[PDB]
Amino acid sequence: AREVILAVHGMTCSACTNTINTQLRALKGVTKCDISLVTNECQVTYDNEVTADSIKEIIEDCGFDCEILRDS
Amino acid sequence: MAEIKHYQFNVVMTCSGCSGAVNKVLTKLEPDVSKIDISLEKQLVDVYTTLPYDFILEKIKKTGKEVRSGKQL
Ligand SMILES: [Cu+]
């Protein structure tokens, strides 16, 4: 797997956040999906078949704002 | 073509950070959507637009929240 980590500025509470992990871990290359609730970091781990640019359009279509914190 | 239609969706929504996410997704469509208005207690979302109905259902499906109903008016 590679890895990506992104600042998801709309993360504050708990009940909004699993709408990320539920969707991402349904994609046929995602290996793991972590999140941090005070620092707004989201840390996703995946094989192949998608770009950080494609992920930014998916997670912005989840109704967030995200900027790619690292590609690692 | 270009005549405004009215749509209303009932959607499962816990937080003000749920309606504030729906608002952030639908903001991208204001060039062809003329009004957006959410009622959290009524669990519903009102839309007025020239965009095709199934494209809004699919932007809701990418927002990821579960849908109780959708209709045109
Ligand atoms: Cu929430």
Side-chain angles (χ1 to χ4, degrees):
Chain A
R2 58 188 287 191
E3 196 173 338
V4 293
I5 184 179
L6 53 150
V8 188
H9 297 280
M11 295 203 315
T12 299
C13 92
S14 304
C16 300
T17 65
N18 338 271
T19 310
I20 303 174
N21 176 290
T22 296
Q23 287 188 94
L24 292 187
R25 295 195 70 207
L27 304 178
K28 300 298 300 183
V30 174
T31 317
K32 191 172 67 197
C33 178
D34 303 302
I35 50 170
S36 292
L37 296 172
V38 181
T39 61
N40 75 76
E41 298 179 341
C42 161
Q43 181 175 52
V44 188
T45 301
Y46 76 92
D47 178 63
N48 182 34
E49 304 192 81
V50 69
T51 58
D53 176 67
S54 285
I55 291 169
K56 178 162 162 55
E57 194 172 78
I58 293 168
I59 299 301
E60 285 203 71
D61 275 9
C62 296
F64 304 110
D65 223 55
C66 61
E67 296 297 317
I68 303 304
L69 140 61
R70 314 182 298 241
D71 64 304
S72 282
Chain B
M1 187 60 191
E3 197 84 272
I4 297 180
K5 309 304 167 187
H6 185 30
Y7 308 113
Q8 190 185 78
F9 310 96
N10 198 295
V11 183
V12 184
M13 298 188 282
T14 299
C15 298
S16 61
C18 191
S19 49
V22 172
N23 180 35
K24 183 160 289 188
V25 180
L26 293 184
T27 291
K28 308 178 194 183
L29 305 180
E30 294 199 69
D32 289 287
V33 177
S34 60
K35 186 177 179 181
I36 307 158
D37 185 36
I38 305 176
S39 298
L40 194 74
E41 180 57 47
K42 298 181 179 169
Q43 297 269 275
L44 64 81
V45 178
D46 293 299
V47 181
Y48 294 83
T49 191
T50 49
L51 294 179
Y53 177 65
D54 281 282
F55 180 52
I56 293 74
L57 288 172
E58 282 191 349
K59 286 280 171 172
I60 293 168
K61 193 168 177 176
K62 287 184 78 194
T63 310
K65 313 303 178 183
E66 288 295 292
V67 178
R68 288 182 54 217
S69 58
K71 60 176 65 183
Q72 49 162 23
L73 290 168

